[PDB]
């Protein structure tokens, strides 16, 4: 498409800008901040994280239940930026595991569970603490 191409141009420029500590937009800044916070979390905890993610047994029929159990425990007593990063990293490892197991049908579903959870349980705390801007500023 032609809006396809424009989105490709924005994404690419967003990426080049961020590599130099600039931002195309607040949304681009949040995305890039998140990708790198996710990397730092996963590298920081590489052995422990990878061993945790190997403790889970995923099937298309029960993954949602497992996701709810992990996440509600993650946020049992509230929210902080650290937990939000762990939440994304977890979602990402769940998708990778799903594809490793030939369960790619789960991936779009995991995205929907996450977005819904953000929407309902996380966004109120985020906006209460200054918004995604606060996260960009501390997580570079």
């Amino acid at each position: 498409m032609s809006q396809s191409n424009r989105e490709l141009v924005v994404d690419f420029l967003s990426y080049k800008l961020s590599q130099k500590g600039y931002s195309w937009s607040q949304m681009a800044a949040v995305k890039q901040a998140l990708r790198e916070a996710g990397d730092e979390f996963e590298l920081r905890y590489r052995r422990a994280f990878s061993d945790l993610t190997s403790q889970l047994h995923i099937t298309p029929g029960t993954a949602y239940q497992s996701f709810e159990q992990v996440v509600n425990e993650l946020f049992r007593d509230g929210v902080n930026w650290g937990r939000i990063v762990a939440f994304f990293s977890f979602g990402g490892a769940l998708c990778v595991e799903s594809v490793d197991k030939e369960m790619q049908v789960l991936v779009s579903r995991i995205a929907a569970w996450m977005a819904t959870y953000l929407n309902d349980h996380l966004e109120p705390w985020i906006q209460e603490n200054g918004g995604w801007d606060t996260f960009v500023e501390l997580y570079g």
């Binding site: 994280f49 889970l56 992990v70 902080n80 501390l138």
Partner: peptide, 21 residues
């Protein structure tokens, strides 16, 4: 299991939150 993963993520996240604060 899953819940006791979330509790040992919640280890990781709170002790990142105490790097990033």
């Amino acid at each position: 299991w899953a819940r006791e993963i979330g509790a040992x993520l919640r280890r990781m996240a709170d002790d990142l939150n105490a790097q990033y604060e």
